[PDB]
Curated annotation (Swiss-Prot):
Summary of the tissues where the protein is detected: Expressed in pyramidal neurons in all cortical laminae of the visual cortex, in neurons of the substantia nigra pars compacta and caudate putamen (at protein level). Expressed in neutrophils (at protein level). Expressed in the brain. Expressed throughout the adult brain, but at a lower level than in heart and liver. Also expressed in placenta, lung, skeletal muscle, kidney and pancreas. In the brain, expressed in the cerebellum, cerebral cortex, medulla, spinal cord occipital pole, frontal lobe, temporal lobe and putamen. Expression is particularly high in brain dopaminoceptive areas.
Domain COR: 841-1011
Keyword Zinc recorded: no
Phylogenetic placement of the source organism: Eukaryota, Metazoa, Chordata, Craniata, Vertebrata
Impact after mutating K1177A: Loss of kinase activity. Decreases proteasomal degradation of MAPT
Domain Roc: residue ranges: 628-806
Modified residues (Phosphoserine): S592, S744
This protein's name: Leucine-rich repeat serine/threonine-protein kinase 2
Membrane topology: Peripheral membrane protein
GO molecular function, one term: protein serine/threonine kinase activity
GO biological process, one term: regulation of locomotion
Cofactor(s) required for function per UniProt: Mg(2+)
Implicated disorder: Parkinson disease 8: A slowly progressive neurodegenerative disorder characterized by bradykinesia, rigidity, resting tremor, postural instability, neuronal loss in the substantia nigra, and the presence of neurofibrillary MAPT (tau)-positive and Lewy bodies in some patients.
Active site: D1265 (proton acceptor)
Whole-protein residues included: 558 to 2527 of 2527
Length: 1795
């Protein structure tokens, strides 16, 4: 017990002699003598002179929480420790330091004048929370224990609240700990992601809390600005009024301000941190309850707390719930419901008391299981109902008393039911859209529609119908598809207003000519799937001049009559799948409006589908065939041999080359193209000229031949018969190649030696050769091939007769008709062949385009791309339109040069040094031609020489070859086609980023690659033949691990996308005989894993059919192999493993259509997956498995939060799972829910679409079709995370199967003409059109649905009208500039997608409501609004451009500027006094001459001059001073001497009224320059005016009760900033001051009257204006001075700089929010107001001056009035949060692509 004296003497001695292992003992003595207060302090005060220090400090301070000021000693010790070793805070916070510091800063220190201690404590905490992680852990450790004050103080200091665990983060735990609602309200109102709030919602549903949910919902589902409750997607199993209670608004909500404790603490901590850092009604209507699986809603049918808000509901949604029997009490409580839709619920009978609501419409119960009869109560009258939707129930009879109940019904929908018997009269008076589709209706009673004289859209599909009951003469749209009709009945022929007729799928016989329709306004005639033989139109065609769509597909058509050219307005003709047309009439060329015209499954009189043929080229072609056509006489006679033959020695005698001057020719290089014409001296003068291509036979060029083997050809073939019956076998590779490349081309075998002998090989040529997989042999001769003889003349005659009768698809190719333009261009190319340099006969596009100008060819830029191609086919000039092959500008005339050049490197060998392995080479050679040489070889992939490359295969020893880890898939085919491997080993080669950029070391011989990354990732695409096999197998070995399969699925894809691209004859099922298919893609597997001695063959087709299961097994079913080990491509297991279907969880029923709700009779259904809702997209039989697999590989790696993300994909059936967009596409939204778009959701959709485009264009892929049908919303709650999402299946479907021009209306100008290839600047134009249709809310779409030709051609140039003048809409004029930017014709003048997103992100785009350009050179220093008229307001202005008085009226909705001189002296400021009697509001004129002039609002003549003051009046005000037990008001005229002229509200009418109580306040040289009023009305409107430099205040006394001075400041940094004239003052919890040229505001107070704050402007400007403003370095004499103040209610304070800037200061916690520059030049006057029920706007009267004539010392002023949305300070930070959240989501989604 002696330690006390010891420590006392140590404390005495540690001070005087400057003392120098004591600390260990003084630490231990605490634990040896604990709890003794007298020695605790003696120790701690000495510690200020191993974490045991912390371990004993925190525990001591905890055990001595509030004893006395030993806490002062301990905290002094801690601070002394930190200021030398700051990292000790990491250990303090580690042990317990929060448990003591929170109790300290919460031990009722407020109201305790112990501030000297709290200052120390906060100074310490400011350093404890230096590191960000320390803050984020102090927050976590402050949220467990319920401590609202400290958790808010920690939030005001940063310390984000979305970092704890991201699945069990702050709120996720806080909701479990039964926290206080005030604690959750602080986490929510600060930064907090949505996905965690949604999880916490469920947790707090688990418990019963009526204030933690009601605060979670208010941030999850409440669009307060739009009066909505978007509670849809939540799986809230129940609904309680105690939850929605505080959601509804109520006026009685008003509170005190007690959180200022947290503000004080946070500001003191921040101050110490900085000092340490620098030195050292409005009833809401929409109530959405869609996805909440409500099993009953009776909880609302009580007398609950919200039973008063329901009487103004006006919309209620309950669709997709599990309800039943809508409660009786409810449907009577809400007496203003006008949109009740509840479908997909499990109802059982239509209540029929639902109609007992007062004013209802759009009653929608349209997926329930309503019973057979729906008998309606004959005593309830509901004449308000419009749309009685009842689709997809189990009805057996039309509603019973429909007539006498709903008279004014408009669209009775009854589809999907089973209405069976012949219906009833149904005398409804106001129907407009009937609907009875998919019922079982045999026939209608012939008086059915006889009494509904307004029907317009009768739609009865899929019935069993044969007759029509006298349709009313007002019929417009009539859909009768899938009926069982035979003839268009007379009831449809006689409708004098018909406008559309959908009668597909009926076995019709007679489509009547236009002389039987009696309706001059046909627009659409859909007639697919019928049996229509004739297309009678010759009768009278011009009556149909308006038919815009004529679908005749799948009929028995024979020809299209030539009268079809009269229907000029025809837009989309369809005659596909007829298979018996065979010819198009040349009159179709006049249908200039056709934009799509399919050619599926029919053969015509021309070659189409080249790379274009987009239904627009066909119109030009058939129009040019209308000018003048000439038969085309030219074919290709390709020769083929092998390395020795009569090829160049037989050709010389076919063409009868008389000279043969070359005494001895040599082997051919290349192909040696020639021409030879045959003017047949006969009765027929057809001078056919066919160009032979005498291919080279030497075995080294073979990989370049398959380029020049086309289908329009009549191949020869030569044996060199000298080697009898041995070459016929040795020549079969050539015939096989001919069959592979050009299946439908003949052959003429020619044994080319009889001068030397064994011609019995005719037997073998007849037995093995004629009809076994080989092409259609058409003859076989035995020429001599050196001299003319009858045998060779018979060969010439055979060639003649075969060419003139080639006739593919019965077309007679050598005599088809073509436009004269092509023959003309051909003659010009032949004439120009003679005038080109031999060393470089290439021609550039410009020179040819000059040749056509020289001639009179009528070809335009849209004509040549077909012209040169059709002249390319005929072998006249070679052109390569492959865009990847960047040489499309070159036009190779005389191909016999290019073909010899491309083959000259393949013969130059080196007899030097073989330093490189055989086949690899470097660049060894002329002037700039050598570069293009191997820029063409590589373009042909012949570059590394894939020819002459190591024929011998090297023995490679793969690591794993144990019959169980290897996957093999043979490819048995008769022979390798000619240019197969050099094509194949060049497609697998250049794919380096496998396993996606790590390339493997490859060792490739001629016929194999073996690229290996490692023993687990390799691939050997070999080439060997089994024993006893005349074929050649392509073994592909791959390790069966998961990584390996990717390789397998990627190589089978390359070897299939090649075979159908180059050799379509192989994989062509020869139905004749048997489907040998010429390509047996075997698969190898063995049940006995390892040492099975064999792998059992199994055709891949026959195995594909065994996909009903997943296991393959022999006839002995005990052991089995999974399919995913023998063919991992058929099962989608090669692609990222996350996209396997997992059918055990996918709950989905294709068969029903009421689940097809996604899209009107589309193909995508709605289903459940992983217990969640998704949208599966069933494909039809068209999409082959390979093509679906090809689209999935590109779809699987987009993964953006603005793109429909893939979820699964499988077989049984071929489906595709994607995310479900709840609110459907956008076009339906803006077509039927136009009141939902709310000027901040219209912006969120645009932002999300711009983000989608900015991400697509990053991956170098353009969308090509962006229209309101491809934008799929997800929720209508604006401040959400994911709202819009562009459907991305289209881009994959295109990039795989290459509508390519886009929808007509939503299409760029560069895209409609099609002349040029597109760019990222076409999606931007389409996005601009999307923005114009969002702004006008789909006005252009609706109007263009009746003017499509003008819906397209008006916008095909950048000439679309003004969104405002045409369609009524809010101007929102910071996007009309964005539109006028994105709607330019020059593509690179349109902003790229990154900009159009980065200028959509600006939060002054969503808040600038309208900018109003004042007239040129109008100077106004005073404005005033009109608020007593809430219908429209006006802004009376003054005049500064004249020294004579003039007030300037200005309306707002009309922008009608009215000028009226009303005085003789410059006006300074105004005020608007309203008088509640006589219904007017007089306006005042304060003039510099001193006359107070007043004029009335309506009459501009009842003007009377008030009492004249002394000097220039400077400020006025209209008060709220009703202290006489009634309503009363004054006017406070403040002269430039202080003599405040007060008045009375009604005496102002008096000529020269009485200034009531005039007080001389200041001096004539101390000018009054402001006047204002308190913020609340509780203090009885205490007025606070500035005066010169003297600030005062008063009340109903009108006497100075405060005369505070501001010049006398003890915070002098500069004098004139404080010693200058005051400008404005605003009154709140503090006082804010503005002075002339004073760039700083001084925060004064009411009571203490002290400088509570000094807030500089450029201390915010010069922190953003650092790098973006470089010239400002010489601008040290900075401009920008406070010219005005205006305080938002309690959120922020707006400071207008003298420059063009405007500040947003959150007065409460954080100062700078944003700086909104570059919209004006001087914010001269700023005020708040209310405009047309959209109250709370912030007027800003800016300037705009241009130095056009600044040299004349004159400036061109443009006073730019704007109208900001006062909710801007919330918007800017909410958007800053919403963008960061989507960045964080795009990152998490980009991590999913990795794994
Ligand atoms: N993920 C989704 N969520 C919600 N709705 C969707 C989704 N995907 C598509 N839809 C809707 O389904 C409808 C059908 O879309 P689809 O892609 O089949 O159109 P389409 O390709 O033009 O049809 P078709 O191929 O028959 O011409 C569209 O109207 C679209 O709004
Ligand atoms: N003696 C003789 N020689 C022939 C006959 N037919 C072709 N040839 C020879 O075949 C050679 C033609 O070369 P060719 O094989 O066509 O060149 P390649 O096809 O491009 O490889 C000539 O040199 C002729 O000598 C023939 O009937 N009699």
């Amino acid at each position: 017990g002696i330690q006390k004296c010891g420590l006392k003497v140590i404390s005495s001695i540690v001070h005087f002699p400057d003392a120098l292992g004591a600390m260990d003992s003084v630490l231990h003595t605490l634990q040896m003598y604990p709890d003794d207060q007298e020695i605790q302090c003696l120790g701690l005060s000495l510690i200020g002179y191993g974490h045991l220090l912390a371990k004993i400090l925190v525990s001591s301070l905890y055990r001595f929480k509030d004893v006395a000021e030993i806490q002062t000693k301990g905290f002094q010790t801690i601070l002394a420790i930190l200021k030398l070793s700051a990292s000790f805070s990491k250990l303090l916070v580690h042990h317990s330091f929060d448990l003591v510091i929170f109790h300290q800063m919460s031990s009722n220190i407020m109201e305790q004048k112990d501030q000297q201690f709290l200052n120390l404590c906060c100074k310490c905490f400011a350093k404890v929370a230096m590191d960000d992680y320390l803050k984020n852990v102090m927050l976590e450790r402050a949220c467990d224990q319920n401590n609202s004050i400290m958790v808010e103080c920690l939030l005001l200091l940063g310390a984000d609240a979305n970092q704890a665990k991201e699945g069990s983060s702050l709120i996720c735990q806080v909701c479990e700990k039964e926290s206080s609602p005030k604690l959750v309200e602080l986490l929510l109102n600060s930064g907090s992601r949505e996905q965690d709030v949604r999880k916490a919602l469920t947790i707090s549903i688990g418990k019963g809390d009526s204030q933690i949910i009601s605060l979670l919902l208010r941030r999850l589902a409440l669009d307060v600005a739009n009066n909505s409750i978007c509670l849809g997607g939540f799986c809230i199993g129940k609904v309680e009024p105690s939850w929605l209670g505080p959601l509804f608004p109520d006026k009685t909500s008003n509170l005190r301000k007690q959180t200022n404790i947290a503000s004080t603490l946070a500001r003191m901590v921040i101050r110490y941190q900085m000092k340490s850092a620098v030195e050292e009604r409005e009833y809401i209507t929409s109530l959405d309850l869609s996805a909440n699986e409500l099993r009953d809603i009776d909880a609302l049918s009580q007398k609950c707390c919200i039973s008063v808000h329901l009487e103004h509901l006006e919309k209620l949604e309950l669709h997709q719930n599990a309800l039943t029997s809508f409660p009786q009490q409810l449907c009577e409580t809400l007496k203003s419901l006008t949109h009740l839709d509840l479908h997909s619920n499990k109802f059982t009978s239509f209540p029929s008391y639902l109609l007992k609501m007062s004013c209802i419409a759009n009653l929608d119960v349209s997926r329930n299981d309503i019973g057979p009869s729906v008998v309606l109560d004959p005593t309830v009258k509901c004449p308000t109902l419009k749309q009685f939707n009842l689709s997809y129930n189990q009805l057996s009879f039309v509603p019973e008393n429909l007539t006498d109940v709903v008279e004014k019904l408009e669209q009775l929908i009854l589809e999907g039911n089973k209405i069976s018997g012949i219906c009833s009269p149904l005398r409804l008076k106001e129907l407009k859209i009937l609907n009875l589709s998919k019922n079982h209706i045999s026939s209608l009673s012939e008086n059915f529609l006889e009494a509904c004289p307004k029907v317009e859209s009768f739609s009865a599909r899929m019935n069993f119908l044969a007759a029509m009951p006298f349709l009313p003469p007002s019929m417009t749209i009539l859909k009768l598809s899938q009926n069982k009709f035979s003839c268009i009945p007379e009831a449809i022929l006689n409708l004098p207003h018909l406008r559309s007729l959908d009668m597909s799928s009926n076995d019709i016989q007679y489509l009547p000519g236009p002389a039987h329709w009696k309706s001059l306004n046909l627009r659409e005639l859909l007639f697919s799937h019928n049996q229509i033989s004739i297309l009678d139109l010759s009768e009278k065609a011009y009556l149909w001049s308006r038919v815009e769509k004529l679908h005749l597909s799948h009929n028995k058509l024979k020809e299209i009559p030539p009268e079809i050219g009269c229907l000029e307005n025809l837009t989309s003709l369809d005659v596909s799948y007829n298979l018996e047309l065979r010819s198009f009439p040349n009159e179709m060329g006049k249908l200039s409006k056709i934009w799509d015209l399919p050619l599926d499954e029919l053969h015509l009189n021309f070659d189409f589908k080249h790379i274009g043929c987009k239904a627009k080229d066909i119109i030009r072609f058939l129009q040019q065939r209308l000018k003048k056509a000439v038969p085309y006489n030219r074919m290709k006679l390709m020769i083929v041999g092998n390395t020795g033959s009569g090829k160049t020695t037989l050709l010389q005698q076919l063409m009868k080359t008389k000279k043969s001057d070359l005494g001895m020719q040599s082997a051919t290089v290349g192909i040696d193209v020639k021409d030879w014409p045959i003017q047949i001296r006969d009765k027929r003068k057809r001078d056919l000229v066919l160009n032979v291509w005498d291919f080279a036979g030497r075995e080294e060029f073979y990989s370049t031949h398959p380029h020049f083997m086309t289908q329009r050809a009549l191949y020869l073939a030569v044996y060199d018969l000298s080697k009898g019956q041995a070459e016929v076998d040795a020549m079969k590779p050539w015939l096989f190649n001919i069959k592979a490349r050009a299946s439908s081309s003949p052959v003429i075998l020619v044994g080319t030696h009889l001068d030397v002998s064994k011609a019995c090989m005719s037997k073998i040529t007849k037995e093995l050769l004629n009809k076994r997989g080989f092409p259609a042999i058409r003859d076989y001769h035995f020429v001599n091939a050196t001299e003319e003889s009858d045998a060779l003349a018979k060969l010439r005659k055979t060639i003649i007769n075969e060419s003139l009768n080639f006739k593919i698809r019965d077309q007679l190719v050598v005599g088809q008709l073509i436009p004269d333009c092509y023959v003309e261009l051909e003659k010009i190319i032949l004439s120009e062949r003679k005038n080109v340099p031999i060393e470089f006969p290439v021609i550039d596009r410009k020179r040819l385009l000059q040749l056509v100008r020289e001639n009179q060819l009528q070809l335009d830029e849209n004509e040549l791309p077909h012209a040169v191609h059709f002249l390319n086919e005929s072998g006249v000039l070679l052109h390569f339109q492959d865009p990847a092959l960047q040489l499309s500008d070159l036009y190779f005339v005389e191909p016999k040069w290019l073909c010899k050049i491309m083959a000259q490197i393949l013969t130059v060998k080196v007899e030097g040094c073989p330093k490189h392995p055989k086949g690899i080479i470097s660049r060894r050679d002329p002037k700039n031609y050598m570069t293009q040489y191997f820029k063409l070889l590589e373009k042909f992939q012949i570059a590394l020489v894939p020819s002459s490359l190591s024929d011998h295969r090297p023995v490679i020893e793969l690591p794993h070859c144990e019959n169980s880890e290897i996957i093999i898939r043979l490819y048995e085919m008769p022979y390798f086609p000619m240019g197969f491997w050099s094509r194949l080993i060049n497609r697998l080669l250049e794919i380096s980023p496998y396993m996606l950029a790590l390339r493997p070391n490859r060792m490739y011989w001629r016929q194999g690659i073996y690229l290996n990354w490692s023993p687990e990732a390799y691939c050997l695409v070999g080439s060997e033949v089994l024993d006893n096999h005349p074929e050649s197998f392509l073994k592909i070995t791959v390790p069966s691990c998961r990584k390996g399969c990717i390789l397998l699925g990627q190589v089978v894809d390359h070897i299939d996308s090649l075979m159908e691209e180059w050799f379509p004859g192989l994989l062509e099922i020869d139905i004749c005989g048997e489907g040998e298919t010429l390509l047996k893609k075997w698969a190898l597997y063995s049940f006995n894993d390892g040492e099975e001695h064999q792998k059992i063959l199994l055709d891949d087709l026959m195995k594909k059919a065994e996909e009903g299961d997943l296991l393959v097994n022999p006839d002995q079913p005990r052991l089995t192999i999974p399919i995913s080990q023998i063919a991992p491509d058929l099962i989608l297991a090669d692609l990222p493993r996350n996209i396997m279907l997992n059918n055990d969880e996918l709950e989905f029923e294709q068969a029903p259509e009421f689940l097809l709700g996604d899209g009107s009779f589309g193909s995508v259904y709605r289903a459940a997956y992983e217990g969640e809702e998704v949208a599966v997209k069933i494909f039809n039989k068209h999409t082959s498995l390979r093509l679906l697999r090809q689209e999935l590989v590109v779809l699987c790696h987009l993964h953006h939060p603005s793109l429909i993300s893939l979820l699964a994909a499988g077989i049984r059936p071929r489906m595709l799972v994607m995310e479900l967009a709840s609110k459907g596409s956008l076009d339906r939204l803006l077509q039927q829910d136009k009141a939902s778009l709310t000027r901040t959701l219209q912006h969120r959709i645009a932002l999300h679409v711009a983000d989608g485009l900015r991400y697509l264009h990053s991956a170098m892929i353009i969308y090509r079709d962006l229209k309101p049908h491809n934008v799929l919303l997800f929720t209508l709650y604006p401040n959400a995370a994911i709202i819009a999402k562009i459907a991305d299946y289209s881009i994959a479907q295109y990039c795989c199967r290459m509508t390519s021009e886009g929808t007509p209306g939503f299409r760029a100008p560069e895209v409609a003409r099609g002349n040029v290839i597109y760019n990222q600047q076409a999606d931007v134009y389409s996005f601009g059109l999307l923005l114009y249709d969002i702004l006008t809310t789909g006005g252009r779409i609706v109007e263009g649905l009746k003017f499509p030709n003008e819906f397209d051609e008006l916008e095909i140039q950048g000439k679309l009208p003004d969104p405002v003048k045409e369609y009524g809409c809010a101007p929102w004029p910071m996007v009309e500039k964005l539109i006028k930017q994105c709607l330019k014709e020059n593509p690179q003048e349109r902003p790229t997608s990154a900009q159009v997103f980065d200028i959509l992100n600006s939060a002054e785009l969503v808040c600038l409501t309208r900018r109003i350009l004042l007239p040129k050179n109008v100077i106004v220093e005073c404005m005033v609004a009109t608020h007593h008229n809430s219908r429209n307001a006006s802004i009376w202005l003054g005049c500064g451009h004249t020294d004579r008085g003039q007030l300037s009226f200005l309306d707002l909705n009309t922008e009608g500027y009215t000028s009226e001189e009303v005085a003789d002296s410059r006006i300074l400021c105004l005020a608007l006094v309203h008088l509640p009697v006589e219904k007017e509001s007089w306006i005042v004129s304060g003039t510099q001459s001193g006359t107070l002039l007043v004029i009335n609002t309506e009459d501009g003549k009842k003007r009377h001059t008030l009492e004249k003051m002394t000097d220039s009046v400077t400020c006025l005000y209209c008060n709220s001073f009703s202290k006489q037990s009634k309503q009363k008001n004054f006017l406070l005229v403040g002269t430039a001497d202080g003599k405040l002229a007060i008045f009375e509200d009604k005496t102002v009418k008096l000529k020269g009224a009485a200034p009531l109580k005039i007080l001389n306040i200041g001096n004539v040289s101390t000018p009054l320059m402001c006047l204002s009023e308190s913020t609340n009305s509780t203090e009885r409107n205490v007025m606070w005016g500035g005066c010169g430099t003297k600030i005062f205040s008063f009340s109903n006394d009108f006497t100075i009760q405060k005369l505070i001075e501001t010049r006398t400041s003890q915070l002098f940094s500069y004098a004139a900033f404080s010693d200058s004239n005051i400008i404005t003052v605003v009154v709140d919890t503090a006082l804010y001051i503005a002075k002339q040229n004073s760039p700083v505001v001084e925060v004064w107070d009411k009571k203490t009257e002290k400088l509570c704050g000094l807030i500089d402007c450029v201390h915010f400007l010069r922190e953003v204006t650092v790098k973006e403003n470089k010239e400002s370095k010489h601008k040290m004499s900075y401009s920008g001075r406070v010219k005005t103040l205006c305080l938002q209610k309690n959120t922020a304070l707006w400071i207008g700089t003298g420059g063009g800037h405007i500040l947003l200061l959150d007065l409460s916690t954080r100062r700078l929010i944003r700086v909104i520059y570059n919209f004006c030049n001087s914010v001269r006057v700023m005020m708040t107001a209310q405009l047309g029920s959209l109250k709370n706007v912030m007027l800003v009267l800016g300037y705009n001056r241009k130095n056009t004539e600044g040299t004349q010392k004159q400036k061109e002023i443009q006073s730019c009035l704007t109208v900001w949305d006062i909710n801007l300070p919330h918007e800017v930070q909410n958007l800053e949060k919403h963008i960061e959240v989507r960045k964080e989501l795009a990152e998490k989604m980009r991590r999913t692509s990795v794994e």
